[model samples]
Target: PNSLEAQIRQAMKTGSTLTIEFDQALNQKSPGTLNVFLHPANGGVRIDLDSGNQGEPAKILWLPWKQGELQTLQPGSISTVDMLFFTYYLSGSKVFAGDGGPVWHIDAPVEANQFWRRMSSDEWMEDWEVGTDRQVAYLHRAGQSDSLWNLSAYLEGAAPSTYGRDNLGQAVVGGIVTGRQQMSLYQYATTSSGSSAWSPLTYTLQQRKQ
Candidate 1:
């Protein structure tokens, strides 16, 4: 009952926000400064990988499958590999851009409508989905990197310290790249006796460095 899946289920039922702190627990590598927030979605949780700024909404939303096992949703079932990923880049300075008068640039989602706008105008970037359990998709340059390792807050440059640079030395505003991650789940509860308390559930999450 105290498994990570259980804790996430509880949070989903009660609409509590799950906060994840990033660190390099497995190796002596430099600990990451990125923090992620998770909210309950219809069939799963909405992952909001922030850029370390205060009060900034999620620039991208990854609607993954339910905890423990994959659950079907919408017109077609989404495998753990191909979860729906959406990005909103309504406004901001392009974090990554090519030379020769800026061929292409990468920026986090700035507004909700940007997704639909990109879809309608065919201005969409290449799609990157969850390829495996805990495997994040590639949201930036298609051929640049195999996966995403950096994330950012909503307001670009609001806090530059929060963003991580990619191998190309380009600024990445949003994504997570960890050699390893451990989650400590906590929940607040109110019993029938009108008493409120915090309950903790824990899971040791491990991600091998590629």
Candidate 2:
């Protein structure tokens, strides 16, 4: 169909490889970068995280097959990088926040659809609109005009909406993030002490030939 949804669906097909790179500032006093290689596995994706640290080897991890599945399906026992990857790539059914929280389910027609983000107790509605360029502009909440998470700067070819610059100008190369409280694109995590914190992550995605 040549639709953005179709394109992203095709990008996740078997034999397709996604190279995801992330850069962030770690706790204490240093910056860290993590490189991930995503390959299709049986009913899941095989994650190979390179140990960019000293004398560390690459670690292999397995995640549920679908995009944005990790957010609800398996929340814990995952690498920080895994948490970042699955949390953003929001495509597919039953994909949203975990139990007892605001969850958005995309039924059909991905573009220009008014999908309601259901809250556990209260109700918060948002519109998922796709731009003319075939990339998702932002997840706009009710009453508020500004975007919660701005998905922009599309890479054009294989990585249309998936690989692009976020509002912070740092690369946010992953799936969809709905109803994000944080406005910064690259900001991920930090410790309670503030001595350690994860700075904005810069990314680069490439589809390798099989």
Candidate 3:
């Protein structure tokens, strides 16, 4: 069978090589916007984005669709992933924040839950989820130049409300800026007069290996 586990076991014995690279891939699309990875587990996949850390994992259950089964491939028809995109704090620049490097990064999935927790200890060196959308990415925390990028408002510090929107909101069909099945970062703009509102200050996503 083409099961990932089965194929990997075979590859390890052969000592050859195997890779599943998508055009969008995973993680950061360009320099501005930051994206995560979407692992279609038999049920649902939750990630830290910044996998290198033993940070708390956000356990997300599969969206309504399946007759109660593992998540699997996760096509839009069945369900969609809730992802967030951040942009570099520059003018019309959708690059990631920080010193100017990839906002997103990509790697493969590791263990699950507590087992996955071990990754933060010594398994990984860093975190970044670089990839595509429709064109969308679903991975863990990402890394940027000079600074680290964490999407959750749940994070401590100048987190939550750092931008226009505070915590990662629940995705709806067409609520605010983004539509259902979309993730992003946002910022608010105010004039000297003191009248302002939220505008899209998020980084845009692009495709790789194109």
Candidate 4:
């Protein structure tokens, strides 16, 4: 018997892509324009926040698209343009004033009767000490001290969720550091172990042909 998920899975097997856009009005964050590309990777989805000619997303505050029934899982890893991947894991989130949870992923469905894009509360941040007013955006190394503690998913500081919201009260789909002012996000690039000198996230998202 073919199920809805089965059908969708089959279609996805043909290789589907997702274009995720952020809202300027809702983003409320400066350079308030952002677009992204998403596709299958590992068990969940691989999201390329991409870097345009402007530069890499050197500094950034993590965030997610939904939160409900206090339900689901999420993932994250702060990148310095692909180098020095800083993840706000247990060594970090727990090092804060409040448990700033996983600032990545959307509210996903576990039940067969649930809607894949159900709307929910979404928001995120980098980490304590390193996260404040877009000033703290640097990750040292995997074996570094507090000032440089990067992380991973399904792996502490990681919870999966894909709860989505539409125009009901949004400018686009997805969520992250819903700052109130018209300011840019935390940005940066890596020095060593980094793939590039730096990459700028020009608030744009483009799909790459597979």
Would you list the C-alpha lDDT of every candidate in the order shown?
0.25, 0.25, 0.24, 0.24
lDDT of 2 by residue, 58-166 (tens): 2222122222211122223232331233322222222222221222322212322222222222332122222322211122222222232222332122321221112
Q: How would the candidate models be sorted by TM-score, starting from the highest?
A: 2, 1, 3, 4
* Candidate 1 weakest ten by summed lDDT: 96-105
TM-score of each: 0.21, 0.22, 0.19, 0.18
Q: Could you give candidate 1's per-residue lDDT for residues 1-210 as a string of tens digits?
A: 353334444543454544232222211211122133444444333334432433233321121211111111121211232111221221222222111111122333323234223322221112221231222122232223322213332111211121122322222122211112212222222223321232332222212121
User: Which ten residues in a row are the worst by lDDT in model 4?
Assistant: 162-171
**Model 1 C-alpha lDDT versus the unseen true structure:** 0.25
Best candidate, TM-score-wise?
2
Backbone clash tally (model 4): 31
Native RMSD of candidate 3 (Å):
20.4
lDDT of 4 by residue, 75-110 (tens): 223222211111221211111111223322222222
Q: How do these models rank on lDDT, best leading?
A: 2, 1, 3, 4
User: Which portions of model 4 show Cα errors greater than 4 Å?
Assistant: 1-32, 48-138, 142-175, 182-210
Q: Report the CA-based lDDT of candidate 4 relative to the real structure.
A: 0.24
